[PDB]
Amino acid sequence: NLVSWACKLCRSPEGFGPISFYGDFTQCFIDGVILNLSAIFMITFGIRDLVNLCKKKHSGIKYRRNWIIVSRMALVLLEIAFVSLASLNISKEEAENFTIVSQYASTMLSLFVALALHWIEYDRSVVANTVLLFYWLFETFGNFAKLINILIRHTYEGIWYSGQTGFILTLFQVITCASILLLEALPKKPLMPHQHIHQTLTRRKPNPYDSANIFSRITFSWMSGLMKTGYEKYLVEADLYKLPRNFSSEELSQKLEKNWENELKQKSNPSLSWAICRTFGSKMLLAAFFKAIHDVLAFTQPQLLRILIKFVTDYNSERQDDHSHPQKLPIVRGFLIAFAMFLVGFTQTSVLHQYFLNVFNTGMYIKSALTALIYQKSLVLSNEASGLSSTGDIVNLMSVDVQKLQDLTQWLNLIWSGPFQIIICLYSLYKLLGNSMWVGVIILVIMMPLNSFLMRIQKKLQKSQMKYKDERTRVISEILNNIKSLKLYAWEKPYREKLEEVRNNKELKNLTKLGCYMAVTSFQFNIVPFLVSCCTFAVFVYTEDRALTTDLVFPALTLFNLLSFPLMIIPMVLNSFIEASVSIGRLFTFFTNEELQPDSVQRLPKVKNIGDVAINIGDDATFLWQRKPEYKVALKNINFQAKKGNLTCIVGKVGSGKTALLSCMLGDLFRVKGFATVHGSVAYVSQVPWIMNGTVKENILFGHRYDAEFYEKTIKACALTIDLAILMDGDKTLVGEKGISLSGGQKARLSLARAVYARADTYLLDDPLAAVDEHVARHLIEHVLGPNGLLHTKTKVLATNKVSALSIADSIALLDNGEITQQGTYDEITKDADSPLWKLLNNYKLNDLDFGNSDAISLRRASDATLGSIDFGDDENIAKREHREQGKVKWNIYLEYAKACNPKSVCVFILFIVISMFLSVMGNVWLKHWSEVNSRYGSNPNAARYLAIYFALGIGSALATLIQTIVLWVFCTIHASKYLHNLMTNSVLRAPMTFFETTPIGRILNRFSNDIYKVDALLGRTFSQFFVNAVKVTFTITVICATTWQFIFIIIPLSVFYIYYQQYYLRTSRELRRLDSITRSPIYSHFQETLGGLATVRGYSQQKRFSHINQCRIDNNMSAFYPSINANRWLAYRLELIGSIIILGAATLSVFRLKQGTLTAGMVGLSLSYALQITQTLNWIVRMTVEVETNIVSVERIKEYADLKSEAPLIVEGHRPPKEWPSQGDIKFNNYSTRYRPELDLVLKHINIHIKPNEKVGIVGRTGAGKSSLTLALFRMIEASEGNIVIDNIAINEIGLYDLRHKLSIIPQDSQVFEGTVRENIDPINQYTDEAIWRALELSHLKEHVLSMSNDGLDAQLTEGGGNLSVGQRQLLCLARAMLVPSKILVLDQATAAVDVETDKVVQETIRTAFKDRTILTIAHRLNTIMDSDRIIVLDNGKVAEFDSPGQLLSDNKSLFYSLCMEAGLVNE
């Protein structure tokens, strides 16, 4: 019945059906659906906006009425005129059709609504309105479809289907609608001059996303200005924009806090997950809608491919039949199918990136909200509940688990969109191939567990690699820290060999195994998609009686990809869900954790009167440390009053209640009974000082206003004047994890100075004086604490056992057993000696997750994501910024890396990439030929032959891929890694000592561990994924151009645009990733800092300030992360647009070949099968260029360290001295003078001295006299500026450094021990016997201790830095090392040693017994040790002032040595 009503409405022969015989929409469908629904859309939503805009004030923003609005209104009036005039053109027969008249009427009404809406929108909107933009888009599209329809019917039937005047008016309506669309979208409104006078913007500019109309938001055009800016210069945090309106972490945290509190109150089973879903879940629903549309559009494409191959076949059949009534097929159908393919691609892109936009926004919301809520929770979290877990664990709760809940949102929609795509695909393939599809399904089902098994093995080998990398890093740190000892002892060779052993025979072995398993997975992912199709066709051809023709063949090839790649991602989704589940469990355990009692102590306004109670604990109060597992009473029946000005002291033993009575007044303790009141502001001084990372000045000010007068007075009172005079920048010196490490007393005085400067009304001093020196303690008691001091008007409570501090107290209470047993003034206790207080006092990395499934690029991306790996951060990227974006790529680095690899191996690897892709393409060409033969015969002749050849080509491609990956890993990457590490080691170990002094050890350890790992595990993979996809795109374009040579003229400008976008994305995304990485870290560091000082922050009540700082840092990280994400969308939209244009060009040129009569179905099948797959490869090439550009900086750094200028040669062939030398120990300096560095003055000046054989010499001088430089001059750690040295008649400048240093013994200034066995630390070369080592240990008095360490004896392990050995034991170990060396010369450095005397006398014993025959030079600091010597070198300002016997020197009263002994207090008379 009902359809007859539609057949009464429409009265045209083509009917109300959607697609006509010619392939375009019928005129009945255009009038009845497209233009009518567009008009109804306008009539509803435009009037909705017309209502919603007129409620807003007209003077919010003033725009001047220039040509823009006049043009819009005038052209809308013109459009109304044309619609009316065309409505007059309707003939008698045309008027019978309901659709035409209804369409014109509804369009007229919608045009009036749009005419009003333009005028209202111009004044009362800052962006071009979305309703108008979409309405004019649909109106242009509908009128253009009508114009195309009319042109087609005129061409094929010779009639203007609605009159010539109808045609020309439709043309003018197309033009006018397009012009109004562009005038709505592109122009930017002109502000009135009043607004610019009002403007005062000087901070970061507002975000352009808020000013972007819907076409700009879909295409992400708002990013282009930032991409251009970041391509012209290096980006800095001031160049970024503000966050959009709703991204502030305060607002999000408040929303989620409201929902979480409602969850806690409403339900007896609260859950954090449902609170998060209830808060932020709307955008995930919208994203789900978009993902569904994307899936449907993605599966539409093989249908269009099948229809176009069918059209080509039927067209060629009809033309051959004529060559050898129903309507002969029109060629317009092919062009319209091609344009349909283009439209499907474009819409798919535009929808997919709005899906990504929504999921990434939701992830950012979750991260900001949860980070803010964790921080806000930790401040109120009770002291003991905080004590339950380490600060590192809670910082990992913020750092890891919130990252996992962020990452979940990407994977979230795939739990339904996987099965959705799989069901659509299986239905489509069933409609194509029947029951043959099930073998293709079964192959993927079987291959999934094998793929998970391989992923398991790769996770195993990745963990093993991280273990071995940490081991090598430990060895490198050992070598670098003790580099001076290595150079002086000449031990660099055995330790280099040990390092090489560890590097080669464990790490590179594991890397070879990991490379082979990555080759196996590469072969798996290559062969399985082929096997699916091959076995499906095998089952089809042998069982179905249908001919395996082209339209069945190539759409099936397209569909098997869309089947495989969702199936092979679902396990990774489930894995992510499990990780997010445990993360939610940890977070929920943290948020439900117990908080402080909020009404423990009543804060009140301050007290003004002196002697009036400011702190009162009354009604016999009782306080608890804990309420779990039991009610542990801290303090029982306390009664305590403290009064303004009166210093009131708390006395007790350790754990007898000191900390509890102050933590009470902080409100940390839970209160059972009684009441407690604290008037006024509070200032807490912790028992263990807490220092913020920053300057001394900021540690003092602590958020208060800077007052120079009181600041200087405070520093004077707290006795910080001397220290802050000594410090590098004074009070601007950095302290904490960054900068200097202050002593305990210094930290205590800083905390006390902070408390003083705060000027709070009430002070709670938790024993600051313990760490302070007694005279400085007297200074403090006089200046700050005492009755005459600064705080004499403030209430002060001081828990301490110092009798001196207690003597000035105005009230004293002994607290023991958790009870105030006794309280009074000091006289009241002093009068009774037997009372208790009297006696007891006086007598006692990254993860760039951006995957969307149903592509092979996406299967690679997702499998890499689930393997995860690691890719560590950069450091001191700030220094190179001074160059400020010259932008030229250093291609010499690439060639030097290509030479690290064997270049012929690189050529072979590239060749096998080419051969793999060639065999794939030839397999598809053979499949085309086979399907054409099947089409000719109408059956499957000789199935075995064609199928065997296709199978052989597929396995050829698979084996070529396997050989490629095997060669890449085993031959190129590992060889380059070995060469680079060996080169860098041999360079660094031979560098002069000035390099190690200037360059921090942190940098060198970073180079050795992190950059070497990047060169090992990542760079080869990035190069592989670049080259494979580049060859794949080259061969795709080759195939398409082979089918239609005219395609060259399209791909040239498309490649120009491709290079343009790739350059912009490369530079800007590089810099935005840098900004994100640098801004991410301060959040967790700040959280660490806050967790170390919760009692202080709650003491000063700086909770709100610290929360604001954390929120600002979260927002400052999101401000850099947001463009970093949206740059990917900006790139990917344009590259998928380029792919869509490629599909359009290929299809249209194919249809143009069809017109000339030279086209078979197989050519279209092959060319469009290849064109459809290019979209994701095009962008994956660019993102691999970016990852290659990032990772090769490691090669640049390694080449930097390789190029260091070395020391003098270790062996000089023409000058090698004998084995006996130095046989007697004669030394001569002949006019020797030297400087530490070229940037410094001469340290030793014109030394000329002769040291006789076997004589014992002492060297003395004031600070800066250059004593230490002799230790470096003899061993040639510093070269000569003038003159030379001669040892046993051999000059020292001629000899090689190994021959020199190997035959001089030294007891160095800094005793250093290597992590290893005792025998290794005494004799790494294993040159000396165990008995000699035992005798050396015996004489150095270590033997018994070494035996007591373990049963291994000599082989007993020594930890890193000699942790299990005392400093004296280390010095005796160095003494043993010097003992075993048979050289006749000894240097005994003591320029800074002051540790112990008991080891000193043992050193003297070994000097006079073991070294009895050696020439001994003592670089002496302890002057008292010297007087046994023969001759003394008195250095003064670098020159040898005196060289004479101690007796002769002390004979002269005016001699410098006499003055030294006098000032030292050794020789007064």
Residue numbers in the entry: 4 to 327, 336 to 855, 890 to 1514
What wording appears in the published article?
Yeast Cadmium Factor 1 (Ycf1) belongs to the ATP Binding Cassette (ABC) transporter family and sequesters glutathione and glutathione heavy metal conjugates to the vacuole to detoxify reactive oxygen species and heavy metals (Cd2+, Se2+, Hg2+, As2+). Ycf1 belongs to the C subfamily (termed ABCC), which, in addition to the core architecture, includes several evolutionary additions, including an additional TMD (called TMD0), a lasso domain that links TMD0 and TMD1, and a flexible linker domain called the regulatory domain (R-domain) that connects NBD1 and TMD2.
Here, we sought to determine the structural changes in the dephosphorylated Ycf1 E1435Q mutant, expressed and purified from the Saccharomyces cerevisiae DSY5 strain. Surprisingly, dephosphorylation of Ycf1 leads to a complete loss of the R-domain density at its interaction site on NBD1 previously observed in the phosphorylated structures. This density displayed several continuous segments that allowed for the structural assignment of the C-terminal half of the R-domain (residues 890-935) continuous with TMD2 (see Methods for details of structure assignment). At this site, it adopts an unexpected helix-strand hairpin motif constructed of an α-helix (residues 902-912) with pronounced corresponding density in the cryo-EM map. This region encompasses three primary phosphorylation sites on Ycf1 (S903, S908, T911), including the RRAS motif. In conclusion, our dephosphorylated Ycf1 structure shows a dramatic rearrangement of the R-domain that occludes the transporter substrate binding pocket, resembling the peptide-bound state of TAP1/TAP2.
